[PDB]
Structures are given as C-alpha cells and as structure tokens.
Design a binder for this molecule. Structure first.
Ligand SMILES: [K+]
Ligand SMILES: [K+]
Ligand SMILES: [K+]
Ligand SMILES: [K+]
Ligand SMILES: [K+]
Ligand SMILES: [K+]
Ligand SMILES: [K+]
Ligand SMILES: [K+]
Ligand SMILES: [K+]
Ligand SMILES: [K+]
Ligand SMILES: [K+]
Ligand SMILES: [K+]
Ligand SMILES: [Mg+2]
Ligand SMILES: [Mg+2]
Length: 1328
RNA sequence: GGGGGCCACUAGGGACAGGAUGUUUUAGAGCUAGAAAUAGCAAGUUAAAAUAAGGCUAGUCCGUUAUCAACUUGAAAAAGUG
DNA sequence: CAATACCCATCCTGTCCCTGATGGTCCC
DNA sequence: ATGGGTATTG
C-alpha cells in the first residue's frame, strides 16, 4: 500500500490529493461522530482547503502609532494645564472644568455651558471680537496690554495641540527671508562671478513672480520673461529653477562631462561633487540660490508682509477670513441680482454642493469649487472670483488639508512672542517660558521609541534613572546613546561564520580594504613572452592599491592597464582576466575621509586603524548630529574645527556581512596571518575568502566550526513566521504542513513515496502616478503638463507604457499618438517564447513590433544603435529599469546558453520560498540516518512550476475553468502528484534537479522535449513513441498511454471532492469607524462609557467575532413569562473578552435565563450546516448565511466551456471548432444543470427566472459570447457569499440569506482540515 | 543542483518618531410677521473634547497582525482519538 | 419575516533594519 | 473592492 501526495499552495487555498502506483485516487470509509444516524461515510482522498487571505501588520501598526500620538497630544495639553493651575484657579476656578465637559449636553454639564467665560454676554462679545482663533492669536502676538489668562491659555493650547511638522532642522525666520532680498543677493553673487556677463534685475518684481500661486516652471518662465536676452536653461535660469524646486542640469552651464543634475529635495554630495569641477569659487553663488528656495517656500505659507506683524501666519489666516467674508458678501449680492431662484439651493441646501453643503454639509473645497464654477462663469462680475477659484484661493476656510506645509517653527515663533508679551504681567509665565516652549518643541527621538517600563514588546529604551519621563527631563532620565544603539543592534545581523560577533559597517575602511583585496587577488594577466597567466603578487597588489585605488574613487581596467602595467611594468599590451571594464569594489570611505581631513598620511598609518574604524562606526550607528559630535569629541584633539565640522556632517547607512574578527581577527595557527593578511599576500595561490575558509591546511575553518552555535530551535510556526515572504503565502505554507500531517494519519502513519508541491505565482495607482511624475519632471518634459492623467487611468498597460516612454516609440525615434494606442503594439523585449515575463520590465510600447527586428531574439543591433541614448535617458529618469535597459541593449553584447537557461527556468523552480517549504516537509518526513550517518530519504520532496501542469492540461484536454467551482485547486494538486511522480520515474537522473537534498543545443533540445514521453506522436522541427513508456534502466513502467489517461479523466470527473472552507474567528476592528450622528436606535454604540448615543451619536455595524447557539428562556410580554428559545447570538469582537470571562453572566445580562451551559456551541464564521436535499449553508454572521454547496459540473461541459469561450495546429483548431458546433446542445444542458442545482440548493426564484429569461433572450448571440457569459452565470451558484453578476447586459443582483433561523434545526458539520473526519450534530434535537 | 562575498537594479516585509484633514456633541444670543404651521430676511469661515469600549502591569505603557473543526484528559500549555 | 438600496476614514513626512528577484564576477 | 450591517418599504 504505497502512495504519493500532490500539493498546490496558494494565497487563499491549499489543494491536496493522494495517488497510488496507478495514478489512482483511493477512497475510504471514514468514521462519522455525533448524534445522527450516519456512522461512516465514503470519501475520495482529494480536496482543497479554502481560507481568507492572511493579512499584513501594516494597518495594525498604523493604528497603534496613531493611538500613541493621540495619547501624547493629550499629555501635552495636560502639561500645559498643570502649569496654569494655581493662577487660573485665582482667575476662574472652573475654566478647565468647563473645557473638559465641552462635549457634554447642557443637561449633563455640571457648569455653565459657555466655555471661555461662563456667561452669555462675555462669550458673545468674545466671538464678535475674535471670529477665529487666529484673530486672538495675532492680537496676543502684537498687543502690549495685559490679557485675560484664559485667552492666553486658549492661544497657547491651540498652538501646542496643532503644532506643525518638524521636517526642517534648526531655527527659522532668519530676517524673515523676504523674497526680494534673497533674489537680489542671488543677482549680486552671479554678477560677482560673471562681471563680463551681468544681469539687469532692475524693475523686476521678484516678490510677486516667485511667490505667485503658480507651477514651478511657470514662475520660472515668468521671471525669465522679465529678463531679455536670457533663457530658462542658462546658468541663472537653472539657479532660479533650483530655487523653485525643479531638477536643473548644470552640465551644459559649465561644459561638464559629469551630468550635474541638482534638486534641493544626495544634494549635499551632488553640490560638493559639482563644486570640485568648477572649484569653491562658485559656492557662494549657489548658496545665495538655496536661501531663495526657503524664502519662496515660506512665501507659500506666509502670504502677508512680515514687517507689520510678528504673526505672519495668523495674519495670513485672517487674510483668508477677510477675503472669505468679502467674496461671500459679493457672491450673495451677485446671485441675488442675477440668479435669484438658485440662491436657496446655494445657501440653504446642505445636500447640494453649494455654500450650504460646503459649510454645514459634507462638501469639500474641491466639490464646492466644482459645483460653483459654472455658476460663476454663467454670471457677470465673477471674473475676480473665478481667478481666485482657479488659484484655489476662493472662500477658503482656515482649517484645511494644505496646512501640512506649516512648520512647527512658525507656531513656535507666535507662541514665544505671546509668552514674551504677557510674561511681563504674570511671573509664572516668565519662570515657565522655556518649559512651555519645550512642550511645543519636544519630540520623542525616532531612535528611542516608546518610553515603556517593561510592558511593551515594541519598546527598547534604556533609562538612565527610574523616574517618570517628561519633556524637560528627557535628556537626563533617558540614555539617548544606548537607546540609539539598541535601535539598530536589535535589527542588524551577526556574522554567520562567527555568530557572536557584530558585523562591520558597510562603509568601514577595513571592510572596503577586504572587498577590494578579495576582488583583486583573483585577477590574472598575460603578456607576450609569458608561458601562462599569473596572479598578482603581494607587492603588485599593494602597488595597485596605493597607486590606483588610493587615488581614484573607481578604478577601471583601462586605468589598470595604463596607469600601472605601462607606467610601472613597461608593458605595451596586457590581457586582464577576473575583472571587466572596472573593478566592482572600491575604497570610497577612504576618499570621503581624505576630502574631509586632508591628511593622507593620517589615513595610511596602520596605527590609526582602530580610530578610523570607530569614527565610521559612530558615523553609521548614529544619525543625530549632536550625538555624533558627542561621540567624536574624544578625537577632537586630532582635527581642526573645520575638519571636525565637515566630519560630523558626513554620515553613512547600512552594514556589511562579515565581522572585524573574521576579516582581520582570527589567525591561522601556523602562519599567524589573518584573512585580510592572506588577501594582501598568499604566495602563488592567492586564495580568496571562500578558499581561505575551506582549505583544511589552515585553522580558519576549524575555528569557524567551533564558533558555530545553534541556540534554541523554533517551533514550526515560529520558523515559518521568521521566513521571508508575504504573510498570506506563509498562512498557506502552515496550512499545507498541517494537511500533510493529517493525510499521513489517514494512511495509517505510513509515509508517502513522494510529495509533489507547486506554489502559485504572485493605492498602487498612487505609486504609478509617482513613478511617472518623477520620471517626467526629472526628464523635464511638458507632455504631462498638456496631457493630464489621473492615477486610476494608469491601470491601462498601453497608456502607462506611453507615459513611461515619454510618448515616443521605443524602437523608432518618433512621437506616439495617445488616441492611436489601440493601433500600436506591446512587445516583449526578450521573447515570451523564452522568458515568460509579462511585466512592464520586459514589455515595450512601439508603433509596430515588426520594427524590433527578428522576432526570435533580443532587439537587433540597428535598433540599439538608434535608441541607446533615449533608453539611457529613460533609465536615468527611472522610467525604465537597468534590467529592462540591459535586455534592450543585449544585441550589442542572446546566446544559445541563454535560451537553454530560459527554458529550464520555465520548468525548474528556484524561488527560495518554495525551497523553504520543501526543506520543512523533507525534514519532517526524513528523520533517520544510515550507517554513514547520512540522511535516509524515504520521502522525495519534488517541486514543480505551474507551467508543467498547465501545459499538461492544455495538451491532453484536461481543461480548467476557475469560475465553475473550487474543484480546480484539488485537480491541480492531483495532476501535480501524477506528473511529478511519472517524471522522476521516467528520468531518475533528474532527481538532482527536482528533489530536495544533496552541448547547449543538447540541453535546449532535451529540456524542450522533456514532456514528450507522455505524447504518442511528437512534431518537432514527425516522430512517434511507443504506447507503454518505461524506465530505460529499471525497465519499470512509468506511463501506459492507453490506460493511465483514462484514470486521470475518471479522477477529474469524480463529483465528490473535499472542499473545506476554513472556519475562522473574526478579529480586528470593533465596528465601522464612522462616527454617526445621534439617532434613536439601539444599533448605535457609545464611543465613551457615559455618552448615551441618542444624545451623542456613536458607532454602528459591529463585527461578530463568532456566533453562539443559546438554548434558554426569555421573558415575554408585560408579564415577563419565561418562554423557551433557541437562537444565534453574535458575540461582537468588543463583547468577546467579557463573554468568555464569564458566559452565564454575559448571556443573562443580554436577557437570557436558565441557559443550558453545556449546549452552548461556539460557531465561527463559515461554520457548515446541512439541511434538506443536501442543501448546505455557511455561517456568514449571526443573522446571514452564505452558499455552502459546490456545483460539480461534468467534465464534458467543462471542456466545452473552455473551448467555446476561447479560454495549436490549424487542423486541431478546426477539430475543436467542429466539436464546439457539433455539441452545441451542451449549452442548453449546461443551463439545465445550473437550474436543477439552483432550484435544489440556491433558492433564488427571482434571480433564476431572470437568468433563464436572459439566456433565452440571447440564443441568437454568437456561441463564443454566450459561453463567455455562461461563465458569469456561475456567480449565482458559487460557494460562499452571494454576489452580483452580469449576463450580457442584464445585471443580476445578489439574493441574500438575511435569516439564520433554519440552521437551528439543521445538522451542523465540524470538519477536520482535510474534511475527511466529520462530526455531525443534529441541532433539531435541541430545544423544548 | 545547493551555498558565499562583491556590483548594478528592482519587488516586498518589520519597527519607530511625527504632520494635516474628517467626523461627532456642545459653544458662537438668529430677527420680523403671524397663535401656529409657515413666509421673508440675516448669518455661516472658529473653538473645546473624543478619536477604537477600555486594561493593569499605572508606563507620556498596552488594546485591530500571526494562531483557532469536534471530542477525551487537562486550571491551562498540551498530548491523545477514527 | 422579504427586498432593496446604501454605506463603508483619508491623506502625508522622516529615520532605520531585513530578504529576494534578475543580470554580472570571483570562489566552496 | 467585497460583503456584512442598517434603515426603508412592504
Ligand atoms: K447644569
Ligand atoms: K527671455
Ligand atoms: K463640509
Ligand atoms: K564589473
Ligand atoms: K546613519
Ligand atoms: K582641535
Ligand atoms: K479577517
Ligand atoms: K485573525
Ligand atoms: K551570486
Ligand atoms: K494628527
Ligand atoms: K450652533
Ligand atoms: K475547520
Ligand atoms: Mg484614548
Ligand atoms: Mg478638527
């Protein structure tokens, strides 16, 4: 009794099948438990587990961090209130109490309902005086009078509660950067550097032009237009563009070779890098430009003169309010005069998108502008209002979405101003001025995380002392250093060879020395007289390092040949091997530090090694400039303040993969030399890192083995979670392992012969729009400016390719037409006959694919000559990738080995995740070791790609139609088992390539014809094969083409297939997040304990974690007479912990009495119930059901639907077409099969009748179209939740099962993971 | 085949610190002519508070991921059962 | 009860770690 | 997006 297992691992499914020697699927009687008359049941050993997608932790994390932010904002306000407590108690002893209960209805308010003052007169007077908070803010900033303390608190609290971003380090408002003066200083430094070519900037109103609410390039065009004989791409134009935020190219301005693209948003290097070529001579010039950027940016936020107020922000908000008032008055009068019938709809209808809906309804600024633009264009006198509308500056509010550009420094300026104003009248303000400022300014450093005390699995902070941390004691109670170190050390890897050693920083000098020597030691060179290529000696390698690697950032092969072999060795022709074009490794950190410290002798002295290694470490471990300075202070005596400042400014990111103790630490017992010592010099063997750690002559290997530790073993689940993959496929993996365990238990604990596994292949429009916007603005093209596109629009392949190609053909240097995209072609770079890649990375939009060249290869050489420059531009704009660029440019460098490789890649799985699944299964099956202490592989784990069984299905007409039912997962698993076992039986030599564990034309031919042994006749550029295919060596039979195909057909035709939808408790949010308005409904859920939703609104739509069958009695009528009931009670996710802590008390609180504690059945989502005539339902909620049956459509109809819908040789195409038309009656039959199914199980009379009418309406339609829509028809029959579908143009809405009463008398079915083991409970025997 | 260092390019996972809206109740005295329904007009831009109910471990912490047929013995974790 | 239509929080900045996919190079 | 909650109409 031998057998194999076939598995199909997917993101929502795991298919499984058991096969025997004859590729047959067994069938057993399985015991049935429960209280029904059935004691056993016949099961086929084939099925598929279904489950909802595994979810990512992203949403949970976002909610967690937002939670923390709300807590901490509340704490900011609490600090501020604690500061005011005593003096406010002297002014108004209940002010903060009125504030805390501002939400409460007056009935529930324990104080006066007017918050600020507590009487109606003063409150109305306040609001008349300061219609917005910014009015009071500006007053307190500018005025010299003593203010009411409550008014002060309100302004300061408004600044603290909404403080603004911190994306700008340092302080702000350096003389308030009025744009004219920075523009003038730019002109001045430009005229300083170019006295012969000066710019006349007189009469140019830079303030208006650069601060205008216009696009960057348009403001650039305006300013350039104000300068005759001066162009936008010149030096000054490029500087103004850089100040406006564009990406100008300074190459052409200074006749550069290096492309000097600069954007102020790598710039720190990109400027230094550039300055080198033209000197520091020009630095100040560019600097006078950078400042302007700041000013321009501030001109976006502060739209008022900054010399009339120290509150430019609040003044600009008041400008908004005043223009809103004026424009609203004018608009009201205009509409009164010209369109008097619309006035109401505009100013009274909250449902309409007029001013009413804009202020009181749900209309956004954008929706209101869209609603009122035609009304303004239709009337007269609205020209200025239309101008303000198109500038997005009409009837503006003050609390909006574009306020994210307001830095915290501005709010801080106004806060500090108010403090210095009123600290003269209150002493507690003066003595707590810096404290309040710190309340506004303090941020938890990202490298500290939560300030937990041992109850957060996310926390890592170390405390210098054990006491409550506040904004003013943070630097003292918290260890910024140890916390910033643990921030990274908990996420970095250790050296795999020496597990207890930390890896080196990636940009470590020692690490880069290692990499360069390791690459340089395998180089070989030949000259004319030499007999054989030779290695570089230790002396030669040191000479190359000193002369070349320590003088150029990158060392090319040309530099090696000329600057060394010619200069030193006196060789006119030298052939180099082991390195191509240039060296991969390089001593970049050496050159950074040589620029910064300018002491080459310091860098070359081995004595300073340690120090340098520390510095880089410090520069990499930390990112806070203050901390970097504090750490580098111990070397302050070695460098000037210039060098030390330049040194603290430089920072590195990322870490290496080896430890210092491996590179330059452990030494060989006899040589005393470390690894790096062998790299620098190793006789005439020049052994690299791998050889060094594998030669038994040396002790490196033995010490590596000894250093190895294993630690604690993960559980299966722990091991799977720590894998690298999408959590959905990990859910699939774990379910697969559980399935295999249960299947082995079914077979009497006998382990299978083989296990064949296949793994399915694997918001976004926002990323697409970002890709194109960046590529086109980096490109500098106005095709996006004239052709606007929305994010959704990029879900079209051809249009997305159009924008990625800048509207040009990719094989011809010509423009493409948008409206002609239907006439163009989308071609694969490397042909899909070789690389089955259908992504944008291997596809190209061209006018005609003929223009690619020959279709059997990579684009021809002529196209590459024509288009390499344009492709390089698309590559630098990141519109095409480097892999795409390399495949496009391969003709100047496709070989037969490449084709053999592509074909093998289509068949041999190499994804690491599938190998991990194979490793898990193999280590669970094969556990014993032989006499040589080598693993005994009883169970062979084979892995296959989907194309094998796909091609098998299409070649032998075992077609799949996914929409008919869920049987195709299990069928895929079965075919996988069969194909894999037969394949390794026929060619055992291929075990290496397909089983886990330890000429180009020949392999091309072989791997292309590997699957031909199944066929009877093969036509290959006609040969015929025997009926019985056997193994050549063993003589064992692998495939009988007369009998085994019939076996496969019978297995696919079997109607009983164990589909099991995984029952899962629901988790996540309590309910819909929308805070609904007050309503007289018990569906409303209180957002806080005392906030009765009928007064305050609240949530609805709670999510049921799982339902519960309650058999009890409830009071009835005014007499409270106990009446026995049996019903489904949905325990909501929020009620879950309370219900589980004590279920009797929970249920009695809900109203139930005398609950039978033993008849309480937990029913998760998708719980299975069987009713009459085999009709099945799954629990969707406590009050709704999903379809629970599969429609087992016969195989002839499945194949007919495949062929007819257009889901080879022209003669075979004709035979298939002829079979379609000869079996046309199948159509009606299929309908019949659906109807009898629906009437039996679905029970949607209206829908089935509408569908029958639709089918009888389109009987004259073409057969292909009718079949395509019959495919849609199965949405009515499909397992699971009902959904709407369309038969041609008729739309069928979903019939829901809005009542769960019937299942209380049906039979509940508990299934094991495979569905082979059942427990069935007659629920009709409960109640009375 | 499997594994490693490097280079180049991409696709995804995880954690932290922050920003702007939104929503909800209250506050921002609506007025007049009618008894009222209702008519006419005025006004509107702002704020406070909450933003998973809440928890104990009381931290400027934690509360939406992963995991879950049934049954026996189990406080549970977990084994066992056809 | 049955059918029907409607609703559903959104957007953004920064710092950092990790694997895996493809191509290439040098090795065990 | 899907698919369960909700109010409306009946
Ligand atoms: K009261
Ligand atoms: K000009
Ligand atoms: K609104
Ligand atoms: K190279
Ligand atoms: K860093
Ligand atoms: K010094
Ligand atoms: K879920
Ligand atoms: K879950
Ligand atoms: K490699
Ligand atoms: K916020
Ligand atoms: K009001
Ligand atoms: K289950
Ligand atoms: Mg809270
Ligand atoms: Mg708000």
């Amino acid at each position: 009794k031998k057998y194999s297992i076939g598995l199909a691992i997917g993101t929502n499914s795991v298919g499984w099948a058991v096969i025997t020697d004859e590729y047959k699927v067994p069938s057993k009687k399985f015991k049935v438990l429960g209280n029904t008359d059935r004691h056993s049941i016949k099961k086929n050993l084939i099925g598929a587990l279904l489950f909802d997608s595994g979810e990512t932790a992203e949403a949970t994390r976002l909610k967690r961090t937002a939670r923390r932010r709300y807590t901490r904002r509340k704490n900011r306000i609490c600090y501020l209130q604690e500061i005011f407590s005593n003096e406010m108690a002297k002014v108004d002893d209940s002010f903060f109490h009125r504030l805390e209960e501002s939400f409460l209805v007056e009935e529930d308010k324990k104080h006066e309902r007017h918050p600020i003052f507590g009487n109606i007169v003063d409150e109305v007077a306040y609001h008349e005086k300061y219609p917005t908070i910014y009015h009071l803010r500006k007053k307190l900033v500018d005025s010299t009078d003593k203010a009411d303390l409550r008014l002060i608190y309100l302004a300061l609290a408004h600044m603290i509660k909404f403080r603004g971003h911190f994306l700008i380090e340092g302080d702000l408002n350096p003389d308030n950067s009025d744009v004219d003066k920075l523009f003038i200083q730019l002109v001045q430094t430009y005229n300083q550097l170019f006295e012969e070519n000066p710019i006349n900037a007189s009469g140019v109103d830079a303030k208006a032009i650069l601060s205008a609410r216009l696009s960057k390039s348009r403001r650039l065009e305006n300013l350039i237009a104000q300068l005759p004989g001066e162009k936008k791409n010149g030096l000054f134009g490029n500087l103004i563009a850089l100040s406006l935020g564009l990406t100008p190219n300074f190459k052409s301005n200074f006749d550069l070779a290096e492309d000097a693209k600069l954007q102020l948003s790598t710039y720190d290097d990109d400027l230094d890098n550039l300055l080198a070529q033209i000197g520091d001579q020009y630095a100040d010039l560019f600097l006078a430009a950078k400042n302007l950027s700041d000013a321009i940016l501030l001109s976006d936020i502060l739209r008022v003169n900054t010399e009339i107020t120290k509150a430019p922000l609040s003044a600009s908000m008041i400008k908004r309010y005043d223009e809103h008032h004026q424009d609203l008055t004018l608009l009201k009068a205009l509409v009164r005069q010209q369109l008097p019938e619309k006035y109401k709809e505009i100013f009274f209808d909250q449902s309409k998108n007029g001013y009413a809906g804009y202020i009181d309804g749900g209309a956004s600024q954008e929706e209101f502008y869209k609603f009122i633009k035609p009304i303004l264009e239709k009337m007269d006198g609205t020209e200025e209002l239309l101008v303000k509308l198109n500038r997005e500056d009409l009837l503006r509010k003050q609390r909006t979405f574009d306020n994210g550009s307001i830095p915290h420094q501005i709010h801080l300026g106004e806060l500090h101003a108010i403090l210095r104003r009123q600290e003269d009248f209150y002493p507690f303000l003066k003595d707590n001025r810096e404290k309040i400022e710190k309340i506004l300014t303090f941020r938890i450093p990202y490298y500290v995380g939560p300030l937990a005390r041992g109850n957060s699995r996310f926390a890592w902070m170390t405390r210098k002392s054990e006491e409550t941390i506040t904004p003013w004691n943070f630097e003292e109670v918290v260890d910024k250093g140890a916390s910033a170190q643990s921030f990274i050390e908990r996420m970095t890897n250790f050296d795999k060879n020496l597990p207890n050693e930390k890896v080196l920083p990636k940009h470590s000098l020692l690490y880069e020395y290692f990499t360069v020597y390791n690459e340089l030691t395998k180089v070989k060179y030949v000259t004319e007289g030499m007999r054989k290529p030779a290695f570089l000696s230790g002396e030669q390698k040191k000479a190359i390092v000193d002369l070349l690697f320590k003088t150029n950032r990158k060392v090319t092969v040309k530099q090696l040949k000329e600057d060394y072999f010619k200069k030193i060795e006196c060789f006119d022709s030298v052939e180099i091997s082991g390195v191509e074009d240039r060296f991969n490794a390089s001593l970049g950190t050496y050159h950074d530090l040589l620029k910064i410290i300018k002491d080459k002798d310091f860098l070359d002295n081995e004595e300073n090694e340690d120090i340098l290694e520390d510095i880089v470490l410090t520069l990499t471990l930390f990112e806070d400039r203050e901390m970097i300075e504090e750490r580098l202070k111990t070397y302050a005596h070695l460098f000037d303040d210039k060098v030390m400042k330049q040194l603290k400014r430089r920072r590195y990111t990322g870490w290496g993969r080896l430890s210092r103790k491996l590179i330059n630490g452990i030494r060989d017992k006899q040589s005393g030399k470390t690894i790096l010592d062998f790299l620098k010099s190793d006789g005439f063997a020049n052994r690299n890192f791998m050889q060094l750690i594998h030669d038994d002559s040396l002790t490196f290997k033995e010490d590596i083995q000894k250093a190895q530790v294993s630690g604690q073993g993960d559980s299966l689940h722990e091991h799977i979670a720590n894998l690298a993959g999408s959590p959905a496929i990990k859910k699939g993996i774990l379910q697969t392992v559980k399935v295999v365990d249960e299947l082995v238990k079914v077979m009497g604990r006998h382990k299978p012969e083989n296990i064949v596994i296949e793994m399915a292949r694997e918001k976004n429009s926002r990323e697409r729009m970002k890709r194109i916007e960046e590529g086109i603005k980096e490109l500098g093209s106005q095709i996006l400016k004239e052709h606007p596109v929305e994010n959704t629009q990029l879900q079209n392949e051809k249009l997305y390719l159009y924008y990625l190609q800048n509207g040009r053909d990719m094989y011809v240097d010509q423009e493409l037409d948008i409206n002609r995209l239907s006439d163009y072609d989308v071609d694969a770079i490397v042909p899909q006959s070789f690389l089955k890649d259908d992504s944008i990375d291997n596809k190209v939009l061209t006018r005609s694919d003929k223009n690619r060249g020959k279709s059997d290869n990579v684009p021809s050489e002529e196209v590459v000559k024509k288009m390499k420059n344009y492709w390089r531009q698309l590559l630098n704009a990141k519109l095409i990738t480097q892999r795409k660029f390399d495949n496009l440019t391969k003709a100047e460098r496709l070989s037969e080995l490449d084709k053999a490789g592509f074909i093998k890649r289509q068949l041999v799985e190499t994804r690491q995740i599938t190998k991990h699944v194979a490793q898990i299964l193999d280590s669970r099956m094969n556990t014993k070791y032989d006499e040589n202490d080598k693993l005994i592989r009883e169970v062979k784990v084979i892995t296959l790609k989907s194309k094998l069984v796909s091609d098998f299905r299409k070649d032998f007409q075992f077609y799949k139609v996914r929409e008919i039912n869920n049987y195709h997962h299990a069928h895929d698993a079965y075919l996988n088992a069969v194909v894999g076992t037969a394949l390794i039986k026929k060619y055992p030599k291929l075990e290496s390539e397909f089983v886990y564990g330890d000429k180009a034309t020949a392999k091309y031919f072989f791997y292309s014809n590997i699957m031909n042994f199944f066929k009877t006749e093969i036509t290959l550029a006609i040969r015929k094969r025997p009926l019985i295919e056997t193994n050549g060596e063993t003589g064992e039979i692998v495939w009988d083409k007369g009998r085994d195909f019939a076996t496969v057909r019978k297995v696919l035709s079997m109607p009983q297939v164990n589909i099991v939808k995984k029952t899962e408790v629901q988790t996540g949010g309590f309910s819909k997040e929308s805070i609904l308005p007050k309503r007289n409904s018990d569906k409303l859920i209180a957002r806080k304990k005392d906030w009765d939703p009928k007064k305050y609104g609240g949530f609805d739509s709670p999510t049921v974690a799982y339902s519960v069958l309650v058999v009890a009695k409830v009071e009835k009528g005014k007499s409270k007479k106990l009446k026995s009931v049996k019903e489904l009670l949905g325990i909501t996710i929020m009620e879950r912990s309370s219900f589980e802590k004590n279920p009797i008390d929970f249920l009695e609180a809900k109203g139930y009495k005398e609950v039978k504690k033993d008849l309480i059945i937990k029913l998760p989502k998708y719980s299975l119930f069987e009713l009459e005539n085999g009709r099945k339902r799954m629990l969707a909620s406590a009050g709704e059901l999903q379809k629970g049956n599969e429609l087992a459509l016969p195989s002839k109809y499945v194949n007919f639907l495949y062929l007819a819908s257009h889901y080879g040789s022209p003669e075979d195409n004709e035979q298939k077409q002829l079979f379609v038309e000869q079996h046309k009656h199948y159509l009606d039959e299929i309908i019949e099969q659906i109807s009898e199914f629906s009437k039996r199980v679905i029970l949607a009379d209206a829908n089935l009748d509408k569908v029958l009418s639709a089918y009888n309406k389109h009987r004259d339609k073409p057969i292909r179209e009718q079949a395509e829509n019959i495919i849609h028809l199965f949405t009515l029959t499909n397992l699971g939740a009902p959904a709407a579908f369309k038969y041609f143009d008729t739309t069928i809405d979903r019939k829901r099962y809005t009542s769960t009463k019937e299942v209380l008398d049906a039979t509940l079915i508990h299934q094991s993971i495979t569905g082979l083991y059942e427990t069935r409970i007659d629920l009709s025997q409960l109640g009375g």
